[PDB]
């Protein structure tokens, strides 16, 4: 249906009322979100139907209508902006300097902001407005807070 580029909310009517399950990005005819948001289920845009094209449970990413289009990356130095789209609340750019997730496979970026689980899929942006990853998959620290990694896919 509406295939305009931009940030979108993922909603379900399966429970009581309309519950937001996550967020996503429409870019170049492809909808990009986190796998745990949809679990590979077909989405709907008005009368239209989005079907999954690519998906990986370890990367925690899933694209709809085509291959992954987001290829920009964090430079390790610059402050980023999380375009947070919270449940029931208006979209909001939150500037922050990311941290590092040290893994056996290599270092990853990490945004430490306190938002509901339904904010999962919100794009992390650079000073150019490009999407350098998605918010929604990380860890729980000593304070009960969440620290999400900057999850980017692979453009072929």
């Amino acid at each position: 249906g509406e295939t305009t580029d931009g940030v979108y909310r993922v909603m379900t009517r399966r429970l009581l009322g309309s519950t937001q399950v996550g967020v996503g990005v429409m870019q170049e005819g492809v909808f990009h979100t986190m796998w745990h948001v949809t679990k590979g289920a077909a989405l709907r845009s008005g009368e239209g139907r989005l079907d999954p094209y690519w998906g990986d449970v370890k990367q925690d990413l899933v694209s709809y209508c085509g291959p992954w289009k987001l290829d920009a990356a964090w430079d390790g130095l610059s402050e980023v902006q999380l375009l947070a789209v919270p449940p029931g609340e208006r979209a909001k750019n939150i500037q922050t300097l990311p941290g590092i997730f040290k893994t056996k496979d290599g270092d990853i970026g990490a945004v430490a902001l306190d938002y509901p689980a339904g904010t999962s899929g919100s794009p992390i942006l650079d000073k150019c407005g490009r999407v350098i990853g998605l918010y929604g998959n990380g860890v729980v620290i000593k304070n009960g807070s969440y620290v999400s990694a900057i999850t980017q896919g692979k453009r072929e």
Binding site: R9, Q27, T38, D56, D60, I94, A112, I141
Partner: protein, 39 residues
């Protein structure tokens, strides 16, 4: 059945609310895409 709704444009905005710390954490990612704090 899940559905999508437009929430806005993807743009970088100047003079935005600047908040949050930058922590360095030792983590592990499993086959299920779940992260874990390793020490």
């Amino acid at each position: 059945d899940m559905y999508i709704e437009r929430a806005g444009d993807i743009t970088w905005e100047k003079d935005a609310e600047v908040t949050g710390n930058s922590p360095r954490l030792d983590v592990a990612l499993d086959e299920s895409g779940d992260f874990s704090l390793v020490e």
